[PDB]
Amino acid sequence: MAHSPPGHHSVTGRPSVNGLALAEYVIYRGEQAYPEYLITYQIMRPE
Amino acid sequence: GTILIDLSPDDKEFQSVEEEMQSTVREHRDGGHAGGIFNRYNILKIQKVCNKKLWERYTHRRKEVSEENHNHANERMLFHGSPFVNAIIHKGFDERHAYIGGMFGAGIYFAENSSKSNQYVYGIGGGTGCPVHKDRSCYICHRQLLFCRVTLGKSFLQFS
Ligand SMILES: Cc1ccc2c(c1)sc1nncn12
Ligand SMILES: [Zn+2]
C-alpha cells in the first residue's frame, strides 16, 4: 500500500464534472476503517 | 472473533441504514455496465458486525488521527464493495483490500454513493458479474455491501 500525501490522513475524490456524483475517499491504513454493517441485497429491475 | 447480529426490519437502526443505502443510489456514466441497471434495492438482511479486537484496533488509530488534527477524527459512514467482504468482517481491512490501480493510488476506497460501491462487489468494474450467471446486472443473486465507520482526519482534496 502507498502512504497518504504528506500532512494528510486520507484523500477525498471530489467529483468535478458529474453534477449528481458524491465523493469517494481513500485511506492508506486498514486500522482507519471498521466494517459496522454487512448489508445483503438484490438490485431491482425498474418498471 | 467476529459475530453477526441480525437487525429486525422494525429496528430504527436497520431503518436508517436501509435509508442511506436507498437514498444514495445514482445513475452511473457507464449506463449500468459495471453494477447493473436499477434505481433501488431489495434489502434482504442487515447484520451489525461485532469484533472486540478490530474495534479496539480502529479506536486506537482514531485517537492517534484526532490528536494529530485538533481533536477531530473527521469520521464518516461510507459504503465499501468487494468480493472479499467475508475476509474483511473476519480479519479487518489491510493491504490485500487495497485497489493498486486506483486514481488516488494504492489504498482502500470508500463511497458516499452505495450504487458506486455496488460496482465493486463482483470485482473491479463488476468483474465478470455474479458467479452463477456471469451477469454484472443480475437481479437474482444476493449481493453484499459493507457500511463502514471511516476515520478521514485531514483529507487531501483532489478535484476530478
Ligand atoms: C477506484 C475505486 C475502487 C474501488 C472502490 C471505489 C473506487 S469507491 C468504492 N466503494 N467500494 C469499493 N470502491
Ligand atoms: Zn446471478
Numbering used by the authors:
A (entry chain B): 1115 to 1161
B (entry chain A): 952 to 1111
Task: Show sentences the authors wrote.
The human diphtheria toxin-like ARTD family contains PARP and tankyrase (TNKS) enzymes that can catalyze both mono-ADP-ribosylation (MAR, mono-ARTs) as well as generate elongated and branched chains of poly-ADP-ribose (PAR, poly-ARTs). The PARPs and TNKSs form a family of structurally and functionally diverse enzymes, which are involved in the regulation of various key biological and pathological processes such as DNA repair, cell differentiation, gene transcription, and signal transduction pathways. PARPs and TNKSs use nicotinamide adenine dinucleotide, NAD+, to transfer an ADP-ribose (ADPr) unit onto target proteins or nucleic acids with the release of nicotinamide. Here, we report our contribution in identifying a set of compounds based on a new nicotinamide mimicking chemotype,triazolo[3,4-b]benzothiazole (TBT), able to inhibit different PARP family enzymes with submicromolar activity depending on the substitution pattern around the central core. The binding mode of the TBT scaffold was studied through the synthesis of analogues and their complex crystal structures with PARP2, TNKS2, PARP14, and PARP15.
We previously screened a compound library from the open chemical repository of the National Cancer Institute, which led to the identification of the potent and selective PARP10 inhibitor OUL35.27 From the same screening, a TBT derivative OUL40 (NSC295701) emerged, showing an IC50 = 3.2 μM against PARP10. Indeed, when assayed against a panel of two poly-ARTs, PARP2 and TNKS2, and two additional mono-ARTs, PARP14 and PARP15, IC50 values in the low micromolar range (1.2–5.3 μM) were obtained. With X-ray crystallography, we confirmed the binding of 1 into the nicotinamide binding pocket of TNKS2, PARP14, and PARP15 active sites. In addition, π–π interactions are present between the inhibitor core and tyrosine residues.
